[PDB]
Enzyme design. Sequence first.
Site, PDB file in Angstrom:
ATOM      1  N   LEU A   1      51.440  45.817   9.988  1.00 33.87           N
ATOM      2  CA  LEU A   1      52.052  44.528   9.705  1.00 33.87           C
ATOM      3  C   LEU A   1      53.424  44.723   9.076  1.00 33.87           C
ATOM      4  O   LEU A   1      53.646  45.678   8.326  1.00 33.87           O
ATOM      5  CB  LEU A   1      51.168  43.688   8.779  1.00 33.87           C
ATOM      6  CG  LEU A   1      49.779  43.336   9.313  1.00 33.87           C
ATOM      7  CD1 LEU A   1      49.051  42.420   8.344  1.00 33.87           C
ATOM      8  CD2 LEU A   1      49.882  42.695  10.685  1.00 33.87           C
ATOM      9  N   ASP A   2      54.340  43.813   9.391  1.00 31.54           N
ATOM     10  CA  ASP A   2      55.687  43.870   8.848  1.00 31.54           C
ATOM     11  C   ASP A   2      55.710  43.307   7.428  1.00 31.54           C
ATOM     12  O   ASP A   2      54.709  42.800   6.914  1.00 31.54           O
ATOM     13  CB  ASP A   2      56.650  43.096   9.751  1.00 31.54           C
ATOM     14  CG  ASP A   2      58.099  43.485   9.538  1.00 31.54           C
ATOM     15  OD1 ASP A   2      58.387  44.189   8.549  1.00 31.54           O
ATOM     16  OD2 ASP A   2      58.949  43.085  10.359  1.00 31.54           O
ATOM     17  N   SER A   3      56.877  43.413   6.788  1.00 30.93           N
ATOM     18  CA  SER A   3      57.049  42.843   5.455  1.00 30.93           C
ATOM     19  C   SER A   3      56.892  41.328   5.477  1.00 30.93           C
ATOM     20  O   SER A   3      56.295  40.739   4.565  1.00 30.93           O
ATOM     21  CB  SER A   3      58.417  43.234   4.895  1.00 30.93           C
TER      22      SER A   3
END
Lengths: 70, 175, 88, 128, 63, 178, 219, 124, 459, 84, 104
Positions: free
Chosen positions: C42-44
Amino acid sequence: GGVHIEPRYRQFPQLTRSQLIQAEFFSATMWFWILWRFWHDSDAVLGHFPYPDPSQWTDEELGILPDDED
Amino acid sequence: PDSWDKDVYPEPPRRTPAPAPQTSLPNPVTYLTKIFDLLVDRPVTLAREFIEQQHAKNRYYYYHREFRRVPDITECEEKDILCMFEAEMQWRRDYKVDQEIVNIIQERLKACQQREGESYRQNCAKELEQFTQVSKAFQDRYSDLGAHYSARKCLAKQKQRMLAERKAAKEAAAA
Amino acid sequence: SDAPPLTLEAIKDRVLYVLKLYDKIDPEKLSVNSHFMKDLGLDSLDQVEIIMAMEDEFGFEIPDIDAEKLMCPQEIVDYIADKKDVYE
Amino acid sequence: SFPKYKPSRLATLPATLDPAEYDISPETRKAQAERLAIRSRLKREYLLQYNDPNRLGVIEDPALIRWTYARSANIYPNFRPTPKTSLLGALFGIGPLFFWYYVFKTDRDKKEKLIQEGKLDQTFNISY
Amino acid sequence: YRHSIFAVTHVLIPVWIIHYYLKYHVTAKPYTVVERKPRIFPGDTILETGEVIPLMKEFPDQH
Amino acid sequence: AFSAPAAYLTHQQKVLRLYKRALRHLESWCVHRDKYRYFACLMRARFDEHKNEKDMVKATQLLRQAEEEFWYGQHPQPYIFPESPGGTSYERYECYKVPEWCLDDWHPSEKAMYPDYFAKREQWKRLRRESWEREVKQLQEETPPGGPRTEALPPARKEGDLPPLWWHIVTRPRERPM
Amino acid sequence: MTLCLGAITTLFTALCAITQNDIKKIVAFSTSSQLGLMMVTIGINQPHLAFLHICMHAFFKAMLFMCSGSIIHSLNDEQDIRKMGGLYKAMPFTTTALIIGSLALTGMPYLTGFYSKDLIIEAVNMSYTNAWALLMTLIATSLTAAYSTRIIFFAFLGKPRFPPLVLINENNPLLINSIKRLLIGSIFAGFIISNNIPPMTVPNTTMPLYMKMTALIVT
Amino acid sequence: GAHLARRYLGDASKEPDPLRMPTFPPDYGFPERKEREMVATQQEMNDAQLMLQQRDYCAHYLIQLLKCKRDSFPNFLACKHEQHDWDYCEHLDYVKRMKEFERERRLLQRKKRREQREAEMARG
Amino acid sequence: MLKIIIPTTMLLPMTWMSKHNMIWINATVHSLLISLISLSLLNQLGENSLNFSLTFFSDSLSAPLLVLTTWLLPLMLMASQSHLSKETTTRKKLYITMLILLQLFLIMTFTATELILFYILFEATLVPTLIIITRWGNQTERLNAGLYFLFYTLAGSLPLLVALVYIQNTTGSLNFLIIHYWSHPLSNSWSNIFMWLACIMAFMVKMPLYGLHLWLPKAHVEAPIAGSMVLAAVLLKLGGYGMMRITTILNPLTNYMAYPFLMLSMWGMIMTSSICLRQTDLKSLIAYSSVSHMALVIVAIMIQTPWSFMGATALMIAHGLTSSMLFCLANTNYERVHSRTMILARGLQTLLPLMATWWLVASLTNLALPPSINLIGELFIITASFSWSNITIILMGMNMMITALYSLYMLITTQRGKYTHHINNIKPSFTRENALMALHILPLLLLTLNPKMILGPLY
Amino acid sequence: EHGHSKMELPDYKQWKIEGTPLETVQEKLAARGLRDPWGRNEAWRYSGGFANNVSFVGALLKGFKWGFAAFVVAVGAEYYLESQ
Amino acid sequence: QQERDPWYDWDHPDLRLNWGEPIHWDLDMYIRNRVDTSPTPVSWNTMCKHLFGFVAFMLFMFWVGEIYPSYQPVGPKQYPYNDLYLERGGDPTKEPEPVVHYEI
Ligand SMILES: CCCCCCCC/C=C\CCCCCCCC(=O)O[C@H](COC(=O)CCCCCCC/C=C/CCCCCCCC)COP(=O)(O)OCCN
Ligand SMILES: *OP(=O)(O)OCC(C)(C)[C@@H](O)C(=O)NCCC(=O)NCCSC(=O)CCCCCCCCCCC
């Protein structure tokens, strides 16, 4: 003072029929009172005495003579 | 009640209407006043009767103090301290009496205003005039004396007023 | 108030329930110790959206300085438990 | 392109709208480093003094004492008679007094003239 | 029973004290309690004197 | 709150904070849930258009026009959580928080009530008494010359050791003491 | 001066209320607007009518605030209308009580707010007053209706928006009885008081049809 | 409203001034000039102490209404005939006032037209 | 009046010949008994006065002040018990001796049938107060403060003496009764102008007047608790009493000469109330509040109307009681925190609720909440000033607003909010402090029942 | 006695976007090439008793039917009693 | 002091101050209970202009409404006994100039 009602977590809360019938009864009595008053004393909203038209009056009772006497 | 003087504090005859019930529906006010009487006035009246008989068992009196007249500041020598003191005390007592007279008239006016209801502007003209005269007299006598007022300052104010009145009357007569 | 006192069982259940409704996360691969950036990819921005979802679900907002360093569901559960003074 | 925001004394500029923070330079970074260093040193000292089970009193704060002393007792020794101070003191200490004196004197002269002419309607004015 | 004791010790005693004070001390002094005079309408009878206030001028009644 | 602040905020932190603020204020603008979801995903799309961006200069040219646009349409009455620093119940229960040392001023008649609690309190006091003597030396040895460069504290590294400066963190009054 | 002050007060407070998100703030600006209307009534030489409006406003505004407090306590200390959604069926008694209160507040005919507010508008229509004051009074009436609509719509009609853990409850005898007593009040007390007090002002017997009803069309 | 618009956008002197009404003699219309009659005398109209602004030519009906309201107190809906009569009398008073207003309006119209005709005759 | 004077003198041998541990009990008990005896002076006549003898006379202006002076000493002893514990027996007895001498001098000052004896005792009250301030003072500036409190007063009082004896050379007597009865107007002359100034500025200094008030914050801050109570309660009222006594000879020149002081007092109250808004010290704030109240009293005395005098007397009594209570509360805080700073110790309501209630009542009385006698005096003075001129109401209303503002600011800064974390030596309030506050506050709420006892001779 | 009986959570498979305005949202993003990752989470706001909404006019007329029935019954009784 | 960081672990959380840091000369003026200088969503000059314009426009329109009043097409109300002379002011010994009301 009341009965025990548990949380639901994303479903509709538990409702007792007592509060339902109470709310319906009070709304019904409000509307019945409104209709009863509108029926029995209707002059409070639409009035009772007519508003005369100022131009509809004739010059006889308004004290005007045909521009020649005085 | 003989507790006060009816002439000093006049009161109209207090004419009151009689009940004229036009309906057969019994009112709650009459029943409420009856039950209030029975539960309140009777015990209160009995307690007052007991207290009054206890008071009547031991009766003793008290009296009002009379003050003789003394020479005032006008008949007082310039440096005679004794007569100045006597006149000063007499003047202070008269000042207190005048204050209470104004108080009585003001109470009359207030009672008239409350009693008359909505027609007070017409039915209290007599009390208003009485208070106007009394206030004018009191203002002439004692106003503008200051915190350190005395009989000498009141006398000086009166003398100045009489000088002005005499000069004005002399000018008017010879005009 | 009348609110029931929540336990860490309840907190963990609610956290996992919120995370499973996240269609970007496969419900079977997710665990209480499953990292967000590496184990879940997952991204930030996905992490900050997850934090916002937890805020909306629990009714209190985590300060950003504390929020950017919540990398596992167990970390979120522990932070909430410490914030709300949960015994058992 | 949007309407701009104008900061004022009572409505300061937001931090996010300050261009100075976007002029990042190494000396700025070092300055922030030493700022947080002194803040951390003060915090460490306060926490060491605060968690002590043997301390049973009040942690005396030098900053509060300095603030109070500068506000109260450090004014006069640093005071210097300058034109700014002279005019400000003269104005703020004399002007209101003479202004109120003029106002009250005018009002009372008007009232006394009205009384002497007799046109005041001082009826019912018993208490003074 | 609780309500009876409440009414006895929180309503009856204060009203007894107030009624005694008003009826025997406050009303002893003049002008302490002043009542607005009751309204007098035509056709009313007064208890103390007994006379009848006359009716009106028989206005022409229409509608 | 719990985490000690860093010396500065990096660019990544600034972008994340602006994204969260924009989402919150957009939710404040979009009351209903479906409209908020639509516009929030639109905001995410408009936000990731320059995610793979390379150089810092024009990326800092961005996140500057974004701040101005946000401040123009920031919904001057945003939604605030009840316990947040702007909420309607932010410091409601701060008047009910009493320090623990107050219990030392209790009369012996008051301490006759709740005796087990005061026994546990004495145990806690003794534990703090020894742990502080250990902690001061641990902090003294661990700290770098010139003092700490940050307000971050080390944990306990031995068996019987306790974290330095722990008494006034674990003995918080409560969230809702009364 | 009193008429102008009341007019500007009621206008400004209703305009501020028209777009508030806190329910308590909305009701506070509502009661400020009602006080402005009362001051307007004072300014047109109608004191007893203002007192009557005071008496009716007491009932229905107090019940409105109690309903708002019941909702606030139900949803765990929440006041922003962005976070209460569908409560028409979740809490029926609070819903009907608030509906009746908002109807009385807006001068729905033959409720406690009718017998005062319609006379207020009728008297302000045919008095030698400022045109501006009358205009702002009419606009204030319209804005009162509008913010009552805002409260009902944003708090009872849409889909729920509160946190998932539902703690909605109403079955407490104290709250139910306290709400129902003021419900009966705000329904019947207007008629009872208006028909029991002696006549203390000259009635406005004859009116233009549009001027007689103008409060209704404005609302 | 229409009279407000007519006065504030048309000729000001063409419309009557409410603060100066009446501006014409009362016999100027017709010489009969029948007089208004007051039913309630001073004594009874003061003893009931209605109000200073309620003391108008419709005071007798108000006195009757007060008499009933005092008499049939518990049934506050007992009498409506006297309330209706008082409302009718107030309506009649209001229509008399409106008649006065319109009379002055048309009288000013006639005066203005007469003056204009005289000026035109003098000019020619 | 010797029935009050002799027991106060006998308090000295009783204090000096008491046990090392029984001085406080004996002093408190016998001071309370002397106050109970002095309560008999409240029976006044509508006529001139209570002329006991050729030397001492009493009036309904002197009686409330005398009663308050007698009542203050037990409170001063109760307050001084705490901070003198580590003092040797001889020095504690010396402190009690100073307090007893101050009370005796005030008692003889307030009767003072002759003006020269009044001046002698009025200036004799300066020595015990100076010794108390400059000896038992905590901080280093006390000495400096003492000098101020000395010289200011003397700078105002030395000319007065001259004027006083000059009057005796022209009238032949300074007896108050003869001065009142043989009064003559003062013509407008430079000689009479300077005589007026000499007679007035002695009492304008100790009130204090705005611009001559600089000694007051210093003396109140650097004095011990008992010195603060005696300075705020009674020693400020000496100027007002002297002005009331001496204004009977300055007419009609008072009307001409009141303007420079009326302007200074009317604008001065605004300035001092504004100074109270920004103050980091509790004692200084209370001192400036005292300055504002005494400026209002100056306005009342200068107006010279009956209502003015009634309001001034009531305000003097109420201000004395309220200021003493406020100083006592601030001292109770200081004895715990040892700082005398408002912002450092906060949220004390959550730790000391009863003391917070005492703070609330004291602030409410200082705020002039009706029907307290504070508001009675303020309202009478305001009505008198309105009769004097209608514009004064602006200044009076502004002063009322700022007074409420700074009083509630005092209350909120110290009692409300969150407690200071690093302060853990806040023990529960002793019975002594609670009894002190109760004995300060109950007389106020009892005097509100019988206001005619503090309204002065013009009632 | 409080609310302590271990209330259970529903199953997360119950919440489906089907039958909600979130279909419209999903379709409008799909026209641009986007998806909402939290659309399912809010499905409970449209699933149970919240599936039905009442209009403003409908809410205003909450008890109109029973009131009208009682009103006509009373009017009929009044007519049948007065015209006797 | 209102615009300081509210999430920072301040030593004085209510004051939002840290032990040992220099104190602003005007601290007791910015204490979150008094004037705060936090940025606003709208520029200060814009809000000043809008408030002044609204107040001035309201005052001007109130003056205009006073200049141009609103009333009904009616005459002055008629009172029976010489415009109610006896019960409004009194003075019964002057016999005021009588006025009689035109019946129309
Ligand atoms: C903390 C500061 C307070 C100090 C205030 C001091 C000022 C007091 C006022 C002046 C004091 C001396 C006045 C004289 C005392 C009165 C005695 C008297 O009345 O006799 C006068 C004498 O009058 C004088 O001698 C006055 C001369 C004053 C000389 C010293 C002046 C001091 C400064 C005066 C200006 C300041 C005024 C206000 C004081 C400001 C201080 C802040 C009559 O003269 P005869 O000789 O009797 O002649 C009669 C036949 N024709
Ligand atoms: O991998 P992560 O740690 O999650 O980092 C995320 C991100 C990749 C974005 C970041 O770390 C990064 O490296 N970015 C590189 C360049 C960059 O993103 N520069 C900033 C782009 S500015 C922008 O996105 C425009 C925003 C416009 C919208 C403003 C909102 C207005 C709202 C108004 C009120 C509703």
